[PDB]
Amino acid sequence: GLNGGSITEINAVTSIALVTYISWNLLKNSNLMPPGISSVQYIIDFALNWVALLLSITIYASEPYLLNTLILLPCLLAFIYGKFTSSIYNKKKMITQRFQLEKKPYITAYRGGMLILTAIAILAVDFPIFPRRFAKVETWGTSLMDLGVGSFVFSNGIVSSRALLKNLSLKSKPSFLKNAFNALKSGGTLLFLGLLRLFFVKNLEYQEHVTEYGVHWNFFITLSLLPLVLTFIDPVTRMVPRCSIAIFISCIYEWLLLKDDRTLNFLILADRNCFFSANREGIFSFLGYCSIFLWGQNTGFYLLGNKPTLNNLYKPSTQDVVAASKKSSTWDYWTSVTPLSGLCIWSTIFLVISQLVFQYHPYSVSRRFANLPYTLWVITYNLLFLTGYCLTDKIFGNSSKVAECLESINSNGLFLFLLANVSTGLVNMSMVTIDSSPLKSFLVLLAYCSFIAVISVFLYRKRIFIKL
Numbered sequence: 356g357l358n359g360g361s362i363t364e365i366n367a368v369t370s371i372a373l374v375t376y377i378s379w380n381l382l383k384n385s386n387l388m389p390p391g392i393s394s395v396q397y398i399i400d401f402a403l404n405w406v407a408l409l410l411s412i413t414i415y416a417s418e419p420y421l422l423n424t425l426i427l428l429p430c431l432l433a434f435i436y437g438k439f440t441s442s443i444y445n446k447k448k449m450i451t452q453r454f455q456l457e458k459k460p461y462i463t464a465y466r467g468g469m470l471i472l473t474a475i476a477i478l479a480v481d482f483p484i485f486p487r488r489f490a491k492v493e494t495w496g497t498s499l500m501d502l503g504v505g506s507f508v509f510s511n512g513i514v515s516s517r518a519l520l521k522n523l524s525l526k527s528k529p530s531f532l533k534n535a536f537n538a539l540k541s542g543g544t545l546l547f548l549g550l551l552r553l554f555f556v557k558n559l560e561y562q563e564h565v566t567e568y569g570v571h572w573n574f575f576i577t578l579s580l581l582p583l584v585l586t587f588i589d590p591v592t593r594m595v596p597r598c599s600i601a602i603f604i605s606c607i608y609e610w611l612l613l614k615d616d617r618t619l620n621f622l623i624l625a626d627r628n629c630f631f632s633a634n635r636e637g638i639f640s641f642l643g644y645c646s647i648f649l650w651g652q653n654t655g656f657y658l659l660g661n662k663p664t665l666n667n668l669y670k671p672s673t674q675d676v677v678a679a680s681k682k683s684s685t686w687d688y689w690t691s692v693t694p695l696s697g698l699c700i701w702s703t704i705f706l707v708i709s710q711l712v713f714q715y716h717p718y719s720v721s722r723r724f725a726n727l728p729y730t731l732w733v734i735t736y737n738l739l740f741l742t743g744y745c746l747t748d749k750i751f752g753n754s755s756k757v758a759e760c761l762e763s764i765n766s767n768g769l770f771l772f773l774l775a776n777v778s779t780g781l782v783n784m785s786m787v788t789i790d791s792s793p794l795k796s797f798l799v800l801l802a803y804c805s806f807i808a809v810i811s812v813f814l815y816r817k818r819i820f821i822k823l
């Protein structure tokens with residue numbers, strides 16, 4: 356585990372995604388780049404999106420800051436050059452238009468960057484050029500490979516918020532059993548893949564990873580099982596908002612963990628004799644994952660809309676606020692917000708709460724147990740990133756297509772993820788990784804990235820979408 360590393364290094368390493376996005380937008384608006392599409396656009400996109408992240412993670416991990424400047428300062432200059440070679444929105448349209456869901460570019464960029472980072476890190480973990488401080492921690496610590504799950508849960512909750520809103524828009528309430536069947540149909544593929552991976556592990560008899568998730572439990576099972584519990588709870592969430600339920604669950608879990616020490620002693624040093632004693636880690640982390648999913652849904656609630664609505668800060672509503680504005684009170688005026696102000700409010704509240712909790716916590720963070728500080732840290736980081744991406748989108752003024760690679764990876768995330776896993780397995784069976792000198796490993800990584808990018812672009816261009 357090597358105890359991991361500090362958070363500030365993690366933020367400095369990850370900011371490269373946002374820096375590259377800003378540089379790409381500047382290059383697009385610089386007007387020098389020729390109008391028709393050609394090899395130049397593809398080369399520039401590949402260099403900006405894939406090569407920069409790989410350079411940040413492995414070779415230039417020691418000095419990230421300098422790298423960022425070398426990405427931003429040149430492009431900006433080119434921008435100005437365009438501005439020297441060269442010597443609408445309607446309120447009535449908003450009033451007349453009803454409530455519909457609208458896709459946003461920054462969400463696509465966010466998901467594409469997340470998926471690319473993961474795909475790179477999965478293969479990069481084996482080679483020696485990858486720094487050892489970024490490896491996953493054993494019991495207590497912070498590392499770059501602990502934020503991958505939290506981010507995924509947050510994004511899935513944000514996405515499911517749109518299904519919630521669309522269901523609410525319908526005039527007839529669907530039956531509860533129909534909702535359960537829809538959840539089962541959604542989770543069937545993940546459950547089937549989990550069982551297949553379990554059987555493949557039986558056949559492999561590979562190395563033990565018991566402390567990670569237990570004898571039988573796995574990430575796919577939890578991902579498939581979350582929605583069923585959410586639909587079971589939704590009846591209660593009708594009477595009180597989701598945020599209060601998440602707070603209550605987290606408080607109960609933390610009190611149970613902290614009131615005494617025998618619970619920790621049993622959770623850490625117990626024998627594996629019966630089934631419950633065999634898979635304790637996954638069962639106990641399920642509560643934290645549920646809390647993260649709930650907060651992600653609540654955050655996406657007002658983000659995924661197209662126009663401001665009444666009390667969209669914590670509740671799904673489709674009505675209009677201007678009619679209320681004739682005699683709007685203080686509460687109705689404060690709570691009904693546009694996406695940016697709501698993001699800012701939640702960000703500040705979570706920052707202050709996280710600072711207090713980190714100040715007065717006796718233990719450290721832990722991924723195995725998914726205690727309170729871990730969830731707080733994940734939520735605060737994700738909120739900050741999302742606010743940055745929204746601010747960039749707003750200042751650049753584009754509203755109402757992001758780079759090609761981001762859209763291509765976003766379209767077929769699951770299939771490309773499985774293909775990436777298969778390719779990493781094959782390349783590991785190909786050669787001995789720990790032997791390779793740095794240049795050879797870098798060349799191998801470059802070839803693998805090129806192959807994946809070519810496959811993704813070819814799949815997207817022919818308009819073929821595969822769902823597994």
Ligand SMILES: Nc1ncccc1-c1cc(Cc2ccc(COc3ccccn3)cc2)no1
Pocket residue numbers: 369372373465468469470472473474476477499500501502503504506507740
């Ligand atoms: N190894 C894994 N296994 C299973 C699951 C996941 C992972 C995993 C993937 C990563 C790469 C990574 C993704 C997301 C983020 C934070 O989110 C954003 C959003 C926008 C821009 C930049 N980052 C950091 C780092 N690290 O770990």
